[PDB]
Scaffold this active site. Structure first.
Site, short mmCIF file in Angstrom:
data_model
loop_
_atom_site.label_atom_id
_atom_site.label_comp_id
_atom_site.label_asym_id
_atom_site.label_seq_id
_atom_site.Cartn_x
_atom_site.Cartn_y
_atom_site.Cartn_z
CG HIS A 287 2.53 -3.13 0.37
ND1 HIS A 287 3.40 -3.65 1.29
CD2 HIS A 287 1.33 -3.72 0.57
CE1 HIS A 287 2.75 -4.54 2.05
NE2 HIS A 287 1.48 -4.62 1.58
CG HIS B 79 5.67 -7.51 0.56
ND1 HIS B 79 6.82 -7.34 1.32
CD2 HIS B 79 5.07 -6.30 0.46
CE1 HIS B 79 6.87 -6.06 1.69
NE2 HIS B 79 5.78 -5.43 1.20
CD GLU C 162 4.75 -7.57 4.02
OE1 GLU C 162 4.38 -6.38 3.98
OE2 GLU C 162 5.91 -7.94 4.41
CG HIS D 155 15.27 -5.08 1.03
ND1 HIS D 155 15.99 -5.96 1.81
CD2 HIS D 155 15.90 -3.89 1.10
CE1 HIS D 155 17.04 -5.33 2.33
NE2 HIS D 155 17.01 -4.06 1.91
CG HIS E 156 7.20 -2.37 -2.15
ND1 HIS E 156 7.02 -1.11 -1.64
CD2 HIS E 156 6.75 -3.24 -1.21
CE1 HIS E 156 6.44 -1.19 -0.45
NE2 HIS E 156 6.31 -2.50 -0.14
CB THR F 220 5.69 -4.67 6.48
OG1 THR F 220 6.09 -4.58 5.11
CG2 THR F 220 4.24 -4.32 6.74
C1 LIG Z 1 10.08 -6.05 0.89
O1 LIG Z 1 9.47 -4.78 0.80
C2 LIG Z 1 10.14 -3.61 0.55
O2 LIG Z 1 11.17 -3.64 -0.13
C3 LIG Z 1 9.62 -2.30 1.03
C4 LIG Z 1 10.27 -1.09 0.68
C5 LIG Z 1 9.76 0.14 1.12
C6 LIG Z 1 8.56 0.20 1.90
S1 LIG Z 1 7.87 1.74 2.47
C7 LIG Z 1 9.35 2.84 2.46
C8 LIG Z 1 10.48 2.42 3.40
C9 LIG Z 1 11.24 3.56 4.04
C10 LIG Z 1 12.65 3.51 4.14
C11 LIG Z 1 13.39 4.55 4.74
C12 LIG Z 1 12.71 5.67 5.26
C13 LIG Z 1 11.31 5.74 5.17
C14 LIG Z 1 10.57 4.70 4.57
C15 LIG Z 1 7.89 -1.02 2.25
S2 LIG Z 1 6.33 -1.21 3.20
N1 LIG Z 1 5.87 -2.93 3.07
O3 LIG Z 1 5.16 -0.45 2.52
O4 LIG Z 1 6.37 -0.89 4.65
C16 LIG Z 1 8.43 -2.24 1.79
ZN LIG Z 2 5.36 -3.39 1.45
#
Ligand SMILES: COC(=O)c1ccc(SCCc2ccccc2)c(S(N)(=O)=O)c1
Ligand SMILES: [Zn+2]
Length: 258
Positions: free
Chosen positions: A116, A93, A103, A61, A91, A196
């Protein structure tokens, strides 16, 4: 499993993750003329140890830089936050086009991309996992990237991307000066919101930096060369990984500056 393709993409997330339709979903449109300056907001205070970063990986992702969150070497304090939030992960986007990748959108303007920086409330919760499920659990710092001159602070990341083409691949990655990647000005907007990506939990205090950093077209293209698929599986490229903006539903967006 969820993704950003036709059949598994943002519009379908709500089938598997109901909170997709919640009242505190992210990202949003930031309309500058409607945001209110809050003199009670505090300045961001950041300390990011370059020895904290350990691993870069392809989640399928985005890339994910993982940081040792055993203790408080790397923290965010101040801003809208009460107490200290510990650095967990970084990470990025992007979209398939350089004029539509971020975003968050500011007065209709989408940036080329959005970094982010994810943190959790170690002053109140024992672990990232427990914090992720509370309204004051997580804080994510957002930095916009605009097309321009190449950014030497992204060279360290871009150099690793070949080694992590396939989903699941990971490579050791340390001595990463994340502080030097941030813009010189830490003025921000803030609002309560969500992850997100699924699970889309509404546990995030968003801190969105006003000032963008640069990236070249050629640097950004390298990201879209990552796969959203694992080794020995039909190849598909991660050309786009941003969620469309979500309704504000009466939340207040505040500004640290006037
Ligand atoms: C495409 O973007 C990502 O790959 C992505 C990965 C992690 C996260 S935050 C942690 C997610 C997570 C998973 C399982 C349990 C608790 C938290 C985010 S975001 N845009 O800051 O909301 C984006
Ligand atoms: Zn993110």
């Amino acid at each position: 499993s969820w993704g950003y393709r036709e059949h598994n993409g943002p519009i379908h997330w709500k089938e598997f993750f109901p909170i997709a339709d919640g009242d505190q979903q992210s990202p949003i449109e930031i309309k500058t003329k409607e945001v209110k300056y809050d003199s009670s907001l505090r300045p961001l205070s950041i300390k990011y140890d370059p020895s904290s970063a350990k691993i870069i990986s392809n989640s399928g992702h985005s890339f994910n830089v993982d940081f040792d969150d055993t203790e408080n070497k790397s923290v965010l304090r101040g801003g809208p936050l009460t107490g200290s939030y510990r650095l967990r992960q970084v990470h990025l986007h992007w979209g398939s086009a350089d004029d539509h990748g971020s975003e968050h959108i500011v007065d209709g303007v989408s940036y080329a991309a959005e970094l982010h920086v994810v943190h959790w409330n170690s002053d109140k919760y024992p672990s990232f996992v427990e914090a992720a499920h509370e309204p004051d659990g997580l804080a994510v710092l957002g930095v916009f990237l605009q097309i321009g001159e190449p950014n030497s602070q992204l060279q360290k990341i871009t150099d690793t991307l070949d080694s992590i083409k396939e989903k699941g691949k990971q490579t050791r990655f340390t001595n990463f000066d994340l502080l030097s990647l941030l813009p010189p000005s830490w003025d921000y907007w803030t609002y309560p919101g969500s992850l997100t990506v699924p699970p889309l939990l509404e546990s995030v205090t968003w801190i969105v930096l006003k000032q963008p950093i640069n990236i070249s077209s050629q640097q950004l293209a390298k990201f879209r060369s990552l796969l959203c698929t694992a080794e020995g599986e039909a190849a598909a490229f991660l050309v786009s990984n941003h969620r469309p903006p979500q309704p504000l539903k009466g939340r207040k967006v505040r500004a640290s500056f006037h």
